Structure formats: C-alpha cells, structure tokens
C-alpha cells in the first residue's frame, strides 16, 4: 500500500492541470459511455425530458501512466479536482446536477497504461421540442447533444466507446 | 469499517472527530442506486458523526 502511495505522489507531483494530454501533439481522443438509469418526466408543457445517467469518459494521459502495480487504481473522487478532465457539456440541457449523497458521485480510475476513466452520476433535464399536432397519435424525437465547450477537433475528439453498445439501459426503460 | 492507519493509544477509548477532520480521511463513497434527489441534513451543524476506536475501527 505504501508503494502505491509514493506512486500516486509521483504521478500527482509536477502535474499541470492547465495543459491537456498531448498538449503540443495530436488531439486527445475521448471515448464516452452512458448507462441510462431512468427517464422520468417527459413533459409536453415544458418541452423537455428528465434523464438520470452514469456518464463515463475515457482518455489516455501519458503523464498518469505508472508501472510495477498490476491493478487499476480507483482513487478517491476528490482527486478529480487535481487532474485534467475534458471540456464536455450538454448543449440542450436546462438543469443538471451531480448527485451528492453520501458524497459527490464521481469516480476516477487510473490504469497502468495511462488511461483515465472519469465517471459522473448526472440527472439532467434536456429540451425536447415536440410537434404535438398529431397528439395523442404522435411520435417524438428527444435528443441529448454532447459537445466540447472550448476545444476544436484539432485539440479533442469524441467517439462512442464500444460503438452502438456505448449507451446501455435503454432496453430497461419504460415510461407511463 | 477498519483503518489501521488511524490506530492510536491514549487515556481514551473513543475519539470523536469534528467535520473538518472527518472530511480529511477516507470514508466509503456510498450512494443510492435508485435515488433521485437526496439531502444530507446540515441544520445548525453538519448532521454527521465520526468515531475512531483505539483499535482503528471507524
């Protein structure tokens, strides 16, 4: 356990949160996964739907790579404040928050190759403009848009981790 | 739970930790899977208590 402590101290020491991985190099590819816990308030009045998710982001950071410890280092969530994380934001959200009981539902997991997993439990209301002319014989398209606030494709690239299997739990969803 | 790093010896048998020191150590990151919105009461003072036994039991 001690050797892990000096390893983590080595990784965090001399770490600049202001600079992205491969700052001067090619863009960092950020894979994304979602697990849909629930979709609750599909409101026609407010033109929005409420959605709870486990939102995971994967990206390789060579600065955080370590050796000699053959296990995935799941660290306390507060270390997320010390590491660089992507500029991700939901474009069409109206009200979102991280669940914060008993603690902030965050997860930071480092891997020996330098991969960083950053997981968040997010409940967000998202705008869904509905064309209810055919109501109640109507079909709606409700979308969640994910975008980088302050980075372009030459700096950061998004992709769905696992292809079409990136988003899970939709099969288990049922609405009244 | 148990944390051998917080073992101690003294006249007492139980040590009550204030919230500032309670936030300075490791605690389980327990969360409710089916929770929609939860509140940890903070009225008058954070409604939380941490006790450490001499054997290291938290």
């Amino acid at each position: 356990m001690s050797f892990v402590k000096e390893t983590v101290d080595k990784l965090l020491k001399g770490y600049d949160i202001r600079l992205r991985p491969d700052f001067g190099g090619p863009p960092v590819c950020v894979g994304m996964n979602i697990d849909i816990a629930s979709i609750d308030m599909v409101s026609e009045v407010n033109m929005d739907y409420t959605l709870t998710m486990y939102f995971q982001q994967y990206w390789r950071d060579k600065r955080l790579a370590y050796s000699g410890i053959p296990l995935n280092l799941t660290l306390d969530n507060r270390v997320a404040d010390q590491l660089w994380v992507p500029d991700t934001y939901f474009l069409n959200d109206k009200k979102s928050f991280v669940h914060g009981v008993t603690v902030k539902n965050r997860m930071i997991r480092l891997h020996p190759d330098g991969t960083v997993l950053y997981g968040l439990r997010i409940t967000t209301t998202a705008a869904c403009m509905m064309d209810l002319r055919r109501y109640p014989l109507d079909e709606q398209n409700c979308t969640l848009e994910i975008e980088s606030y302050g980075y372009t494709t030459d700096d950061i690239e998004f992709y769905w981790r696992g292809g079409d299997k990136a988003v899970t739990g939709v099969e288990r969803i049922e609405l009244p | 739970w148990k944390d051998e790093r917080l073992k101690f010896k003294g006249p007492m048998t139980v040590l009550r930790l204030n919230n500032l020191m309670a936030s300075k150590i490791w605690t389980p990151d327990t969360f409710f899977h089916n929770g929609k919105k939860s509140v940890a009461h903070n009225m008058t003072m954070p409604n939380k208590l941490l006790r450490i036994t001499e054997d290291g039991t938290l």
């Epitope: 099969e171 288990r172 049922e174 | 899977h33 089916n34």
Partner: nanobody, 108 residues
C-alpha cells in the same frame, strides 16, 4: 460439466418484473436459486452462490441461468418464474408466473 438453461417469456413484457429461477428436488421442496430485477441486480441463494449466474435479455424478454460446476445432488426440476416481489424476492408465493420446468440430471 457446464449447462445453460434459458427462459423465453411471451404474452407480456417483463421489463419491470423480477425474473427468477427456482429448483425443486424430489421430496417437494422449492428452492430459490437466483433472481434479477429491473436494475440488473443479481440476488442468489447461499447454496449456489458464485456457481450459477443469472442474466436477462430485456429486448428479447428472456432470462438465462448459466450453471457451472454441476454435482450429482443438483439433479432436479428447474422452474422459471416472474412477478414483482411483494413480501418476497426469495419466496415462491411472490411470483405470479411460472414455467413448465426443465428436468436436469447429473451422473457420475
């Protein structure tokens, strides 16, 4: 020996229901084996903990039970059950739907 017992449900969508497997050896006692709920949370009996694995296909509305490490005493009739667990989740009375059953035998 290894085996896989599948259960396909028809006539109703069991997305919200707890799908479970029960065992009945000769002598007329029904034993809880495994169960999965809408949250993909797996409950198991003590006798078969770590041996049998329960999974669900919510799109296909089916539940599968993978049996590894079979022994002769596992010879029994296996029942597929579904229903919201009221007063239960380990009691047969809480399940309102049951399968025909499948006989499994093991020889040494």
């Amino acid at each position: 020996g290894s085996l896989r017992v599948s259960c396909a449900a028809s006539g109703r969508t069991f997305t919200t229901y707890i799908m479970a497997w029960f065992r009945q050896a000769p002598g007329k006692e029904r034993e809880f084996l495994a169960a999965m709920d809408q949250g993909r949370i797996q409950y198991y009996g003590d006798s078969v903990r770590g041996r049998f694995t329960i999974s669900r296909d919510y799109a296909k509305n089916s539940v599968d039970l993978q049996l590894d490490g079979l022994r002769p005493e596992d010879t029994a009739v296996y029942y597929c059950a579904a229903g919201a667990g009221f007063w239960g989740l380990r009691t047969a009375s809480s399940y309102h739907y049951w399968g025909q059953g499948t006989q499994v035998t093991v020889s040494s």
